[PDB]
């Protein structure tokens, strides 16, 4: 035990996570937090249309958020309230191009309804000498609640299960989010019985539990990048792409 021998290759073991044609590596073990067991398929109950998961394209990773986490951010501080089935699309529309330009999200342009799980990796690139800690918490249906504006603090999301991203360890936060909405499908576009709040399963929100702490000449900033996989999906209701409207900018 405890025999450090670094070389030109480096010291530690690098773990992978391969998808279709996306491999993204982390030195550190993830702090996984799984808020619910894995969802059943549920196309038998409400779909006669041809249903197929496009796992060769949809299960790839895609960056949907990157943000500087400075030490100027105080203690109780939001960093990103990502609405994850929306944020996969609104990140692309924030890149000033359409949904059909990205391989991950072309069945959202075509199909009408979606049910699937979501993997989320909230990777950080902090220094070893920086001291601080994030938490990444998934809340099911944030915008269908009106007192969440008072719950949205680090004391309230520490009670439900969540991941912790310490800035010392440069930790990575795996986050397996299965589908639990009230209705067993999320429409990707304006559907006859609801138009407002489209494709909103809930909110990944990333508060600060400890701010960044350092010396006077220490590295101030800290970049955080969020990736999302859409693994156990299924799309139903093949429809035209001209009925898909752009997401709300938020």
């Amino acid at each position: 035990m405890d025999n450090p021998n670094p070389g030109p290759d480096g010291e530690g073991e690098v773990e992978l996570e391969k998808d279709s044609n996306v491999v993204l590596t982390t030195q550190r073990d993830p702090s996984t937090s799984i808020p619910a067991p894995v969802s059943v398929k549920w196309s038998r109950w409400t779909s006669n249309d041809v249903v197929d998961d496009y796992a060769t394209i949809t299960s790839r990773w895609y960056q949907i958020a990157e943000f500087v986490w400075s030490k100027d951010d105080p203690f109780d501080k939001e960093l990103a309230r990502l609405i994850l089935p929306r944020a996969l699309l609104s990140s692309i529309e924030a890149n000033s191009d359409a949904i059909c330009d990205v391989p991950n999200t072309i069945p959202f342009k075509v199909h009408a309804y979606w049910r699937g799980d979501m993997e989320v990796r909230v990777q950080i690139n902090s220094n070893k000498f920086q001291v601080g800690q994030l938490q990444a918490t998934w809340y099911y249906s944030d915008h269908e609640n009106l007192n969440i504006s008072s719950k949205r603090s680090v004391y309230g999301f520490s009670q439900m299960d969540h991941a912790l991203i310490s800035a010392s360890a440069s930790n990575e936060a795996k986050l397996v989010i299965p589908f639990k909405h009230v209705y067993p499908f999320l429409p990707t576009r304006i559907v006859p019985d609801w138009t407002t709040g489209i494709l909103d399963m809930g909110a990944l929100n990333i508060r600060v539990i400890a701010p960044l702490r350092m010396s006077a000449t220490g590295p101030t900033t800290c970049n955080v990048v969020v990736f999302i996989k859409l693994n156990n999906s299924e799309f139903t209701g093949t429809s035209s792409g001209k009925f898909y409207a752009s997401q709300i900018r938020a």
Binding site: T46, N48, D49, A112, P187, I190, K242, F243
Partner: protein
């Protein structure tokens, strides 16, 4: 007496005039994909009566429904009329997207192209695609909220226009019948959205 034996009966719901001068994209019907397909009587009563299929009346006493519908199209033609028509199905059209349709947007969704040559009747079994395992009734009691439009819309365009011979007529009637399919089912018994025509008198209670 059984819902799956009342709803399993075709009721005539639409009469479609299909002429020779219809182009290769003309709409023949855009009725909704719910059991409450409508045929209004052109009468002189102050409240308008309405014809429903048996699936609509037996589905009007229930809150929710699900399952496939079945439309029988009887294209009343001789063996010398040749035509071809799309009967398509768009899952999830709100009323603002009800316009801006054509047959080319219809072909991106589920559709059925029928060849009118000799056999002149076909049954398009409308799929049940919704986000919801059931589907709340269209009308409800006399209560303007809780009035939910259909999951999806049934269209019928003219793929290839009608080519009649010079001895047969230029026009063809198409009867459209509705049946609850093999998978159609309704659940929660609530106030019926329909009343009989046995006493059509209605008393307005104005306070003047």
């Amino acid at each position: 007496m059984t819902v799956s034996s009342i709803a399993s009966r075709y009721g005539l719901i639409r009469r479609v005039q299909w002429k020779k001068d219809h182009a290769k994209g003309s709409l023949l019907l855009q009725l909704d994909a719910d059991p409450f397909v409508e045929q209004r009587i052109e009468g002189t009563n102050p409240i308008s009566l309405y014809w429903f299929a048996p699936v609509g009346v037996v589905s009007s006493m229930f809150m929710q429904w699900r399952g496939s519908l079945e439309y029988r199209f009887d294209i009343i033609a001789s063996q010398f009329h040749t035509g071809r028509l799309i009967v398509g199905y768009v899952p999830g059209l709100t009323a603002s997207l009800q316009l801006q349709m054509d047959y080319m947007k219809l072909k991106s969704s589920s559709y059925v192209v029928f060849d009118l040559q000799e056999s002149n009747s076909f049954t398009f079994e409308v799929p049940y695609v919704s986000y919801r395992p059931w589907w709340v009734r269209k009308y409800g009691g006399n209560y303007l909220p809780s009035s939910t439009d259909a999951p999806s819309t049934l269209f019928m365009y003219v793929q290839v226009p009608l080519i009649p011979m010079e001895a047969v007529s230029d026009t063809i009637d198409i009867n459209v019948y509705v049946r609850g399919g093999s998978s159609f089912e309704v659940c929660v018994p609530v106030q019926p959205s329909l009343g009989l025509n046995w006493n059509t008198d209605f008393i307005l209670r104005n306070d003047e």
